[PDB]
Amino acid sequence: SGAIYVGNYRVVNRHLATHNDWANLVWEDSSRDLLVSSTTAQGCDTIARCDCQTGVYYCSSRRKHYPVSFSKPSLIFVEASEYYPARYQSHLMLAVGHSEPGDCGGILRCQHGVVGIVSTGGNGLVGFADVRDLLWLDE
């Protein structure tokens, strides 16, 4: 679990969005596993606007942060789950690192700010949904 709070927006994994997120919907994209809802309170976070390919992510299944080298956002095939059929997920970045289901929503940060959130994983891999291209989060 986890979210990004920036301005009057909450950014979550689309597959973990709540009834309240859907009732306050701003934008969602199944192909990216992202959903953004509106908030009444002003948010705690800064979004990176950069091309970093290194950063640090929070891994809830270890209660620890780990450094990572990650690929640029791309279209990656993701196996079927209870939430989606087998499909290509866009704007996804992969890295070598521990992840389990339950780790979705953990933040990836570089020195410039928040880069994205955990969205996929596998045997020693972790995948992050990029948010750096969503320029409107800042206004």
Contact residues for Zn ion (CB under 5 A)? 48, 50, 52, 110, 112
CB of 103 to Zn ion, least distance (A): 22
Contact set for ligand A1BSH, span 71-90 (CB under 6 A): 78, 81, 83-84, 89
CA–CA gap between residue 29 and residue 49 (Å, rounded): 20
Is 59 an active-site residue?
no
Q: What angle do CA 130, 111, 17 make, to 5 degrees?
A: 35
Is 15 an active-site residue?
yes
- Rule CB under 6 A: say whether 66 interacts with ligand A1BSH: no
CA–CA gap between residue 50 and residue 12 (Å, rounded): 21
DSSP state of 21: H
Alpha-helical runs (H) found in the chain: 19-23
CA–CA gap between residue 52 and residue 110 (Å, rounded): 7
Q: Among 18, 71, 101, 136, which residue interacts with ligand A1BSH (rule: CB under 6 A)?
A: 101
Is 33 an active-site residue?
yes
91 is an annotated ligand-binding site residue: no
Q: What amino acid occupies position 18?
A: T
Q: Which residues bind ligand A1BSH (CB under 6 A)?
A: 15, 33, 78, 81, 83-84, 89, 99-101, 103-104, 119-122
The residues annotated with a catalytic role in the active site are 15, 33, 104
